[PDB]
Structure formats: C-alpha cells, structure tokens
C-alpha cells in the first residue's frame, strides 16, 4: 500500500532521518526496543504503521530507510546511541575515505566504489515493500557526500524506476551566513542534476530558521536539534494522510502532480506553522484564518525572499489537526481578495484541502507545545529566483580567476562542465523570468 523508502546521505541526511524516525516512534507509541512491551498500561499504537515500519512474525518493527555515509564517524556516533537496537547494522554502510565538501572525489574516485552494495540494499528494500509511490532522499548541497553521492545514485534511481516519484530534500547555502567556502562549487553542479534528472526539489536554509527561532521561540543559544525537529515536523505534516486518513485524503501523487506546473519549475516554497514555543502556545487564541494569513508573511518563510517581488502560480495547501471546513473557506475568501498577495492574471485560484483528524503530538524535552491543529503550505512563485541569481553571481566572480579549481582538475573533471552548469542556470533563470511575466 502507501509505502515509501527514505534515503539519507551525509551527516545532515543521517541526523534528519534519525529525527524523523524518533518522531514517528514517539508519535506512534513505538518503543525503542522494537516490540510492544506495554502490557500493563496501553497508550496507543493500534494504527496503520505499515507505511513506514514493518511487522514481523514476532511483533518486531523494522525501519525502512537508507543510512549511507562516507565518514565512519557519523555511523559510529549513531551506533553508540540509544536506538542502535531498532535498525540493522547492514543498513548503515561505513566508508574508508570521505568527500567532506567536495564533488570531485565524491563523484568519481569515491562514489563509484560503493555502488553495487547500496543498489542491492535498495533493491531488497523495494522487494520487501508492496506499494511504492515516492522516495525521501535526504542530502545537502554543502556536503560533498550528499552532493556527489546523491547525484550519482539518483542518476541511476531515476533510470531504474521512471514511474516512481523522485523527491528531494536538502539545505540551500544562505547568501549571508555559510559553513564552508566551496559550497557553490558543489551547488552549481548538483542543481543541474536535480533539475534535469528529478521531478521536484525542496530548498531550505538555516538563517531563516535562526531568525524564526530567535523571534518566536526566543532562544539565545540555538542548536541543530531544533533545526532537525522543525524539518521532521514539516516532513510528517507533508506525509500526514499516508500514515492516517481524513475527510479528504492527501497522498503523494495528488499534490506532486499539481505542485509541478512545468518540468523546469519544480521548486516550491514551504512554510510550517505555527512555529512557537510552550509559552507562545498558551495565551494565544489559535484559529485557521490567522495562521494562514501568517503563513504568507515573509518573516515566517524558511527562504529569505520577498514574495511581493514576484507572484504566485500554484499553491498547495495542507492542514493537520482538528480543522473545520468553515474556517478554511473563510480564510480562502479573505486571502483571495487580499491586494498585498500577488498572483498571475491566469490562475484565479488553486489550493488543496487536507483535513487530518489526528492532531500533532509533542515530544518530552522538545520546544514544540501542544497545538490543536497544524498547517503547511507549498506555493510556487518567481520571487525566489533571486537565490539562484546570487548563486550564479558568486559562481561567476569565483570562476573568473579559477579559485580552487586546480584541485578539481587534478582529481579529474571536464572544465567545460562549469560553463555548462552556468549556461543551464542562466537558461533556467530566463525561463523563470518569462513565466513571471504576465501579458
């Protein structure tokens, strides 16, 4: 049935997968042992867990995910953890040498050594599942592993499976803050692969997360844990009608079908709400209209771009929790007449109604409070194209004198690929420009 396989590449992908799996096990009452030891007091768990977990003959739950990374340090860090008894060691493939923010080695001299193993693993996992709809590929653009390895693996997954959905989730390097220096070097080559060989791609940065946490959550010393928690909440909200049901079931195919207006424009704008702390969820009346209006605010977007600079073409609308259709209709009526929000003169309306009976849960030790209902939006607009513009400008200014390119030449690549990626990105920016232009 509605069963999917998750792919986790690099340190960020592995930790995001860990956060998602722990969120699923806590929200479904799945104990870390892999059994149902609660024989005295039950607290839930009688649901459809086959979507992500698997049921054995002995009552064991086996995760269905791909935990691959080059550096054995991350594998060891997770292995010495408290959830080592849940997954299997064969799912966590170590490595001798790593890329560590490089596409050259990780795409040619490191990537092509471990191929048959991961292909056999994923083939076995797919054979272990009955219904397959899409994949959850978790990687990053800054990380050399999650760029070269992600690209080389997806170039084979897209060709061994053309009828299956190929999603994408990674981190977009922020123009203001950055971790490394060679991030655009990998991004300029990963973007071509994710555009000309994938159906959809989701971009997020960390600076917007920092701004929203310091603004709403009011934290002075943040950490990766909250960043992972937010992404896990977003992923759970997106795939909410797969594990459970609702008034209008909202699956993967139905929204990715409409979330893609053109083969070249498949880069939506996610926004999770409400993103608040415990004290911010007590004396605050929460309805549907206010949060939906808050969803379109630039401050709440995880991508630093002003929506007023462009206009929307397609919007995907989702909900999670006790939501009433009348509130949704009132919010739609309010937003359709809002002059601040801009849209094309050819799409008067477009959105989805995902009514999800199960309310979002909480975690002991997290920051998210108990909210009666959640909401997630996936809109498409041309105002986000500035990030690609800045990326191209940076690549141009850092390619004129060929900074840190002799290393890639010695490792082995064609220098023309840089010009090829540059012209492809230029063409994509052009296409976005003409699409944004009305009559």
């Amino acid at each position: 049935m509605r069963e999917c396989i998750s792919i986790h590449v690099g340190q960020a992908g592995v930790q995001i997968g860990n956060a998602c799996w722990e969120l699923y096990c806590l929200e479904h009452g799945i104990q870390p042992d892999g059994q149902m030891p609660s024989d005295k007091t039950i607290g839930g768990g009688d649901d459809s867990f086959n979507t992500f977990f698997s049921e054995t003959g002995a009552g064991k739950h086996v995760p269905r995910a791909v935990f691959v990374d080059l550096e054995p340090t991350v594998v060891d860090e997770v292995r010495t953890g408290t959830y080592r008894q849940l997954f299997h060691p064969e799912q966590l493939i170590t490595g001798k040498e790593d890329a560590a923010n490089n596409y050259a080695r990780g795409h040619y001299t490191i990537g092509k050594e471990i191929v048959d193993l991961v292909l056999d693993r994923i083939r076995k996992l797919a054979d272990l599942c009955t219904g397959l709809q899409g994949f959850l590929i978790f990687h990053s653009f800054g990380g050399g592993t999650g760029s070269g390895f992600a690209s080389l693996l997806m170039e084979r997954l897209s060709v061994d499976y053309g009828k299956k959905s190929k999603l994408e989730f990674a981190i977009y390097p922020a123009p203001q803050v950055s971790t490394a220096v060679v991030e655009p070097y990998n991004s300029i080559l990963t973007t071509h692969t994710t555009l000309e060989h994938s159906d959809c791609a989701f971009m997020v940065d960390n600076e917007a997360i920092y701004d929203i946490c310091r603004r709403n959550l009011d934290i002075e010393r943040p950490t990766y844990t909250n960043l992972n928690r937010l992404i896990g909440q977003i992923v759970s909200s997106i795939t909410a009608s797969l594990r459970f049901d609702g008034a209008l079931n909202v699956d993967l195919t139905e929204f990715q079908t409409n979330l893609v207006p053109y083969p070249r424009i498949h880069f939506p704008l996610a926004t999770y709400a409400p993103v608040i702390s415990a004290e911010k969820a007590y004396h605050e009346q929460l309805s549907v209209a206010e949060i939906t209006n808050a969803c379109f605010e630039p401050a709440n977007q995880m991508v630093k771009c002003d929506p007023r600079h462009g206009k929307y073409m397609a919007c995907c609308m989702l909900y999670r929790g006790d939501v009433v259709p009348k509130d949704v209709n009132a919010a739609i009526a309010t937003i359709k007449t809002k002059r601040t929000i801009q849209f094309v003169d050819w799409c008067p309306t477009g959105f989805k109604v995902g009514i999800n009976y199960q309310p979002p849960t909480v975690v002991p030790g997290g920051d998210l409070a108990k909210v009666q209902r959640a909401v997630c939006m996936l809109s498409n607009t041309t105002a986000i194209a500035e990030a690609w513009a800045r990326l191209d400008h940076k690549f141009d200014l850092m390619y004129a004198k060929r900074a840190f390119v002799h290393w890639y030449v010695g490792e082995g690549m064609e220098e023309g690929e840089f010009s090829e990626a540059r012209e492809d990105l230029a063409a994509l920016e052009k296409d976005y420009e003409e699409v944004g232009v009305d009559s």
């Binding site: 206009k311 002059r339 801009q342 003169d345 009305d438």
Partner: peptide, 29 residues
C-alpha cells in the same frame, strides 16, 4: 550590470502594468 539594470527596468515596467491591472480590478469592484 547593464543587463541587470535593463532587466530591472523591465521589471519596473511590469510592475507598472500590474498596478494598472490593480486599478482595473478596483474599478471592477
């Protein structure tokens, strides 16, 4: 950029067009 500036001028023309569109919408209302 020169190209940019020009493209920015085109964006300004498009914004003027959209403002005219909004004027038309208000008239309709």
């Amino acid at each position: 950029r020169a190209q940019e500036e020009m493209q920015h001028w085109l964006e300004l023309d498009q914004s003027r067009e959209r403002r005219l569109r909004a004027r038309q919408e208000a008239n309709r209302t």
